[PDB]
Write a protein that binds this DNA or RNA. Structure first.
Ligand SMILES: [Mg+2]
Ligand SMILES: [Mg+2]
Ligand SMILES: [Mg+2]
Ligand SMILES: [Mg+2]
Ligand SMILES: [Mg+2]
Ligand SMILES: [Mg+2]
Ligand SMILES: [Mg+2]
Lengths: 321, 322, 322, 332
DNA sequence: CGATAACTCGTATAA
DNA sequence: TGTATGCTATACGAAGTTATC
DNA sequence: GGATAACTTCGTATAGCATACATTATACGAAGTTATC
DNA sequence: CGATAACTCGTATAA
DNA sequence: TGTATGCTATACGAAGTTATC
DNA sequence: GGATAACTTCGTATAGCATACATTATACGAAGTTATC
């Protein structure tokens, strides 16, 4: 009755979230309704007893703990934004989730992260791709240069556009990073390419002709002939950028298994992780690293370098003296 | 209600349990919320969720900073919760519109600013430039800048330092005792220590000013056109003046600031804080160590205060270039 | 009641959301309680304050330790609150008698016992004394004592290690991965690294027993009279066995466990932890580094893991005599 | 015991409860009771004088009382103690507690601020560091007076073991053993906690052992292993052992006071605390001495049974060893 | 075979 | 096993005691 | 009888810790259980 | 007696 | 000014698309 | 004409990360104030 109004307002300001959240909200509501109408359950308002059976179902489907959490999570957001009791506030639900988390991690489940794209990998890739002339092997080598030199997220590298680019009297470029994705942007408001990586990006800037219009997105599509098609309305999808990583990896280690494992070949974050791991080996303080990446937590970074010989622990040092 | 008017009378009676700055803003936001509330014919208390949303949006329209708007929504909340009534933010209507506004304005290209850094670089310069002066005004300001930079203490905190709060370590280094800060209010205090270099800068300001006359005198005070420091133990230099010492010292090495009307065009009160914060990060100081220096309890803030190097920058750039 | 029967039911339902030992101990206590309850003609649920008190007083009577008594009171409380009823400890009479019984036992003489240390010194010995042996189990045990001291992991944790949870650093050090410990259950888990010397003791037992023929094999498995391994992926080595290894290795050097009935008369499950905790203390390791090594997140547990140097002790004595 | 829970004011089960509390009275430290009773007396008297019902306490009155204590110029830690004891009374008797109401909570917060802004700061014991022990020694080691020998052995042990005066008064002959090294080792049974974070035995250096051994063979406390290590010494300089009466901790504090009087003279005329050594003086000084000799925080804390770093840090805060990161950067 | 090396329970107590 | 904060020590001036000058 | 060193007892004022809460592990002697010898 | 150096207050925004 | 947990964004196989080959 | 190269577009499965909550402080131009030159 009243909830209906809440829902209308919930929608009136749908702008209060990312299209990416709404994707999952809907994506899960779907899965919920689906499961309900097949078991005879009112998908809304959801009854704790039902949700439980549901969550317990996703576990049987093989989904990871993090996913079951997103499902339960979106289910909540839906109910909270309607003056309604969220299923997590029910003693049955929170009780099974604790059951599941333990059951799964205990069963051996485990969280993974991107495959590192370290320095050694930038040099190898710079070698075979360096002397190429193709209007693509150029673009790609410059995207990789930026990925590892600014640890920027792919979605950020996409939005970059010539205007943003400028230069330092040192003879190195400086990508202005306007339009952040946070009020208090933990990373800089300016990322600066090295010397080499500057040259490499320039090469692409000429051969592409994106230079013309400044509102043009630095990176763009490149058809089967070898001609870039600059634009200022559409940006090179994140999916494409991921591919650029995927491809380069394949060009050196063949194809992925028949297996279904994730992170078998480089991906969007592969730069960041590698970047992190290198600064570590170098001796950069955690505060310097955390910022160079725009990280706020400190565990996430320790996660990427948890297997270096430098972070082995005090007991080891003690035993070898 | 009976309890409502009782919860409020309780708060007003002991209004001194809150910062005077909290009162100043509670009142400012109120009159502002009342004004609009009248010239729109709406009840200003208890606030109706749908009316607050309108007001918040009216503020977005006015072109006010995300934060400034949260501050408004913030007092409104405190007023209701301290009353015992549910708060505006307890309604999806206000709850969501607030996010929408934070979301919109950020994309429209808006981000929070921070004081223009005052780093070691700048200190060494401003020092060797006034280092030799024999004017009371100069001698003072050089110490103010030394403490400001060395301790990372906020201007408010500095304004309160009294000669009796100063002691020394066995090696000669000075020690200032601080009781109340922005986030701490205990009788244990905290002891911020000076370097041998800065400790001397204060000593010179102490004698030339004659403030050790009464252990209760504040460390910093006024100095009139005649060049004579006027110590006091009941009137402290205003934080407006310390901000002045900063602006002026910057207008001295860079002269006249822009006509932009923008904020942070010249050194302000927080400048040494953010400046030092940088210098340390840049020097490899650990997270914990950078925290005791600034009085921060979690990496969260410390990290915020960093926007770091640019020119040739450092870190990655400094890594690629073999 | 009606709901209580439910809440208790749901509780039993996902009874897997809790620790195995938690349930084991719940029942055991309810048996001890019910028992005394019947023999004294008192209801057993809801447990009425006075009864719970006469009972706790009964346990103090029966000569039980403080820690043991709290466990009973604690289980009794879990049952009550988990089922929706007020806790017997919520009653001025029960919350007090508990404090009293502790106060009295401590004030008398009673103290908490700790595991008998197994420091680096003890490791070296046990090593140069088994290091050469070619026995299939003499090789396993030394690889266990290695990991225990080196990682400070708890026996139940060491018992769940699978070959697939092992990896290596470029420097060539093993780097076991733990997923569930007493203090945390997550897919993130933590990675404990072994030294070069100790990584070696493991690289051996791995071959000599070929547990490495199925990634899902538990690194440690039983050995039979004949000295032949016995890999598995459905059966972990009992923690009771691990406790055994310690005693055994203690016997091997200090003869037989004197007949005194008391506990901690010879190395046990936790000896590696306390031992390592101590050795790190002496070596001068920092708090954040020791907490990291033992999976502790607070200063007040690490300190808790110490009651240091005996005889000529250290610190103060070293200071004065120096 | 208590003031006088009224014939008609204390009504119902608040009588049941209060009765249960005195039944398990042994649930709290004797000192805790001391303070509960003192506060109640203090509040009770304030109530009479100001015509207020003392129990249950009305919030508005508790508040007038707190503003009263502040006006009497007491420290915030003390005012907190008074509200605390009051809360315990009320809670442990079934009634809702003051400080559970806006009036008291707000006033309390206000008092705290106003007082810190007035410059009120927490004081700690005057340190008794090594250089102090060495001076006291160089003087008192030549005295044959039974009292002086006792005192020097006292000081020696306080500084060496970092034990609290309540613990030193409990050491009894049979708690002393010998180390193959040839130095004493004091076992500390009857600790303070279930889990004794300070250890189970303290070792005295060789020199302090010599100091203690001289007190033993001149006091004759060996006569009965059950005798307390320390005891009285009268007008005539003759020890008086006992296995039933230990020296009051007041007396121990008296040794520190006196020893300070001997070297530095009569105490200043103000009324400030900590103007001469007290019972915690060795603990503090020792923490400092160790800090200067480069000891790990963990090792220090254990040497003194500390469990919360904040405290030892409070003791070594002014050592140049702890000036900070900004001082290092500024001093190239 | 029967004797043995080598390994599920229940209560008590520490993390 | 973490740990804020409610319980638990010490401070110390002054009054009460007991064996000695 | 007093006066007095050297305490003990008191009561209020402050400093300094240590535990309750809700589980989760370990300790260890005794039976129970397999595959060797 | 000006003219001048050197210092409350209200809205806006960072911590 | 701090932080558990609730938004946000990457991962990727697969299906549409649209200019070359 | 039909077969790609190189991408968009999806929807689901996971990783990463950053913010509401409730104050408390700084920014800074204008107007006001007081010894001094
Ligand atoms: Mg808000
Ligand atoms: Mg007392
Ligand atoms: Mg000294
Ligand atoms: Mg003396
Ligand atoms: Mg002195
Ligand atoms: Mg130190
Ligand atoms: Mg006297």
């Amino acid at each position: 009755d009243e909830v209906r109004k809440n829902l209308m307002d919930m929608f009136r300001d749908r702008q209060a979230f990312s299209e990416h959240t709404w994707k999952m909200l809907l994506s899960v509501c779907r899965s919920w309704a689906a499961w309900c109408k097949l078991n005879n359950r009112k998908w809304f308002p959801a009854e704790p007893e039902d949700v439980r059976d549901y969550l317990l179902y996703l576990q049987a489907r093989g989904l990871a703990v993090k996913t079951i959490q997103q499902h339960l999570g979106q289910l909540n957001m839906l109910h909270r934004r309607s003056g309604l009791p969220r299923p997590s506030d029910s003693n049955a639900v929170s009780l099974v989730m604790r059951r599941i988390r333990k059951e799964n991690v205990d069963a051996g489940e485990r969280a993974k992260q991107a495959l590192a794209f370290e320095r050694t990998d930038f040099d190898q890739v710079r070698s075979l791709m360096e002397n190429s002339d193709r209007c693509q092997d150029i673009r790609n080598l410059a995207f990789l240069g930026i990925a590892y030199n600014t640890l920027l997220r792919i979605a950020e590298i996409a939005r970059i556009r010539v205007k943003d680019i400028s230069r330092t009297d040192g003879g190195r470029m400086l990508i202005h990073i306007g339009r952040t994705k946070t009020l208090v942007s933990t990373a800089g408001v300016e990322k600066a390419l090295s010397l080499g990586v500057t040259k490499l990006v320039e090469r692409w800037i000429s051969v592409s002709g994106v230079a013309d219009d400044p509102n043009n997105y630095l990176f763009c599509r490149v058809r089967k002939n070898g001609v870039a098609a600059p634009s200022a309305t559409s940006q090179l999808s994140t999916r494409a950028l991921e591919g650029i990583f995927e491809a380069t990896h394949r060009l050196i280690y063949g194809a992925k298994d028949d297996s279904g494992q994730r992170y078998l070949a480089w991906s969007g974050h592969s730069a960041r992780v590698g970047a992190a791991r290198d600064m570590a080996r170098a001796g950069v303080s955690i505060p310097e690293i955390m910022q160079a990446g725009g990280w706020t937590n400190v565990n996430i970074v320790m996660n990427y370098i948890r297997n270096l010989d430098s972070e082995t622990g005090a007991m080891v040092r003690l035993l070898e003296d």
